[PDB]
Structure formats: structure tokens, C-alpha cells
């Protein structure tokens with residue numbers, strides 16, 4: 001459709017903020033993630049669409065880490081993990097997490 | 107010297123606990139790290155020692171992530187990073203960090 005840059009997919013050092021309903025203080029953190037624009041590349045002759053099955057950029061290589069939402073009541077699970085992406089590409093509509101200074105989250 | 111297993115070097119999902127002098131609550135977390143026994147392999151004929159220059163297992167591949175020691179005074183830096191190891195080996199005495207349920211740190 002429009003111009004592709006719009007960065008394009010790549011591991012990118014961003015920030016998110018982990019917190020769970022009824023845990024006291026939430027926690028922010030930094031982890032490289034893979035986000036970028038993958039084109040649903042139409043080719044020379046159309047009509048073969050759909051062009052590309054929601055090819056969102058998903059993790060080629062992934063390591064997890066997690067922290068520990070401090071103060072959680074003695075009945076809830078404080079261990080909160082997240083991706084630590086190493087490289088990435090674009091394949092089918094893949095679910096993973098969200099499916100197809102610093103900060104604050106309270 | 108003695109038997110080598112004693113696991114041997116490998117990325118290993120362990121836990122550490124980040125906290126800084128005069129920040130209020132400390133934070134624990136989980137991150138794969140590379141720890142293992144590397145032998146200072148003496149060979150068939152000695153006298154060529156030292157055997158191997160303090161070949162501690164250090165990170166072949168490494169990604170950083172960091173969290174945010176919550177509540178830090180408005181004059182201190184809450185961003186605390188750590189390794190997110192992908193693979194590893196053994197080379198010279200390499201400095202990096204420490205040079206040659208969950209938890210609590212307060």
C-alpha cells in the first residue's frame with residue numbers, strides 16, 4: 001500500500017510495565033523485542049489474494065526472563081516473565097503474547 | 107584435578123536479586139546465565155603450566171535486559187540491567203560483571 005519505512009522488523013530495545021490485578025506495586029522494565037513493518041507483498045499479478053496470512057513479525061530467537069512483582073499477597077504468583085528476543089522474521093499470524101524517566105503502571 | 111561433573115558450562119536458569127544502597131524495595135528476578143566447570147586441562151606432559159589462564163566460563167552470546175528498582179529516591183538511577191545469555195564457552199579471565207518461593211534482598 002504505502003511506503004514501507006516505517007522502520008521494518010527488528011529487535012528494538014523498548015519498555016513495558018508488568019503488573020497484576022491485586023498486586024501492590026507494579027514494575028517496569030526494559031527488554032529488546034521484535035517489532036517492525038512486514039509488507040503483505042502483493043506481486044506483479046493480483047487476484048491470488050489474500051496477499052500474506054497476517055504475517056506479523058514474530059520471534060526468530062527468544063529467551064525468557066522474569067522478575068518478581070514485589071508485595072504480592074501470600075496467595076498470588078509474583079513471577080512475571082517476558083521475551084528477550086535475539087533476532088526475528090515474519091511468518092503466519094502467530095499468537096505468542098498479544099495475539100493478532102522510565103514509566104508507571106498502577 | 108578431580109572429576110569434572112560438576113555440571114560443566116551451560117546457560118542455566120538461575121535467580122539473583124537487584125538492589126542498591128538507599129533504594130527502598132529491592133527486586134528479585136530470573137535470568138538464564140552461563141555458569142559451569144571449565145577444566146584447566148593439563149595435558150600429557152606438564153611443566154608448560156600455567157595450564158589455562160583462569161578460563162572461567164563467559165558469555166558467547168549475550169542480551170541485556172533491565173528492570174526498575176521502584177521507589178528509588180528522585181536523585182538515584184533505578185534502571186538495573188543484567189545478562190540474558192544465549193550460549194557460552196570458556197576464554198581468558200574475562201571481567202564482565204563479577205570479575206575473576208523466590209528470594210529476598212533488603
Ligand SMILES: *[C@@H]1O[C@H](CO[C@H]2O[C@@H](C)[C@@H](O)[C@@H](O)[C@@H]2O)[C@@H](O[C@@H]2O[C@H](CO)[C@@H](O[C@@H]3O[C@H](CO)[C@@H](O)[C@H](O)[C@@H]3O)[C@H](O)[C@H]2NC(C)=O)[C@H](O)[C@H]1NC(C)=O
Pocket residue numbers: 064065066079080081117118119136138
Ligand atoms: C529456562 O526457562 C525457559 C522458559 O522460561 C520460563 O522461565 C521460568 C522461570 C518462568 O518465568 C516461566 O514463566 C518461563 O516461561 C525454558 O524454555 C522452555 O523451552 C521449551 C522448548 O525449548 C518449551 O517447551 C515447548 O513449549 C511449547 C510452547 O510454545 C509447546 O508447544 C511444546 O509442546 C513444548 O512444551 C517450554 O515451553 C519452555 N518453558 C516454559 C516454562 O515455557 C528453558 O528450557 C529453561 N531452561 C532451563 C535450563 O530450565
Ligand SMILES: *[C@@H]1O[C@H](CO[C@H]2O[C@@H](C)[C@@H](O)[C@@H](O)[C@@H]2O)[C@@H](O[C@@H]2O[C@H](CO)[C@@H](O[C@@H]3O[C@H](CO)[C@@H](O)[C@H](O)[C@@H]3O)[C@H](O)[C@H]2NC(C)=O)[C@H](O)[C@H]1NC(C)=O
Pocket residue numbers: 011012013030032170171172185186187
Ligand atoms: C540494547 O541495549 C544494549 C545494551 O543494554 C543496555 O540497555 C539499556 C536500556 C541499559 O539497561 C544499559 O545499562 C544496558 O547496558 C545495546 O548493546 C550495546 O552493544 C554494543 C556492541 O554491540 C556495545 O558497545 C561496545 O561495548 C564494549 C564494552 O564491552 C566497548 O568496549 C566497545 O567499545 C563498545 O562501546 C554497548 O556497550 C552496548 N550498550 C550498552 C549500553 O552497554 C544494544 O545495542 C541496544 N539496542 C538498541 C537497538 O539500542
